[PDB]
Amino acid sequence: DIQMTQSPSSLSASVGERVTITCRASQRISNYLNWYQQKPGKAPKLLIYAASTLQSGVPSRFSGSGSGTDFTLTISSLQPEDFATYYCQQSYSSPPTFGPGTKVDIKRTVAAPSVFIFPPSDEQLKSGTASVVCLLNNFYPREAKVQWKVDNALQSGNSQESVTEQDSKDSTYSLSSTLTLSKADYEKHKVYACEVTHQGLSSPVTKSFNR
């Protein structure tokens, strides 16, 4: 099957900017390359087909170039409704395969997250399992790394992250990791510590507690 890769993972830009996203096919696919836009909770809309033809009713500020393996989508003068995820798709071989996507968020000044840890409720400990929640409140940009440590020992395999969408007003993100242990495992250790690494923070921060 043809594997499709996409330019950067994520891109920050602001109304009026010239924006470039690239797409690369794992083999020559001539100009059989297509661009879709997809907003959260919504259906994909066709922007470009055959690498450079503008689907009817798509604004002229959108354009496409490339032939072979390397492809670019270009928005000349970015607008507020152009904030979305962008997918490329090869139509050259069956099955048709899509890129992983390029999300374009709104460029905000950097902002470190406020970090808070929350211990298990005693009510949950009676249930036989213990959730520990780490909150990272109102930060920018998208990228952030959560490392759990119990009695200093880096945990892994038993965490789950969830992220809000870019906020309508302050254009920041907020993230919640949840570490899951049995009541046996939980009470067999003392110190629980969320360690968060983000472009904004000078030195990685650790909130922590003891039972």
């Binding site: 059989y32 259906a43 066709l46 798709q89």
Partner: peptide, 12 residues
């Protein structure tokens, strides 16, 4: 031609 692309989609 076996060259599939998608000009209109539903809400899903």
């Amino acid at each position: 031609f076996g060259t599939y692309f998608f000009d209109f989609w539903g809400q899903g």
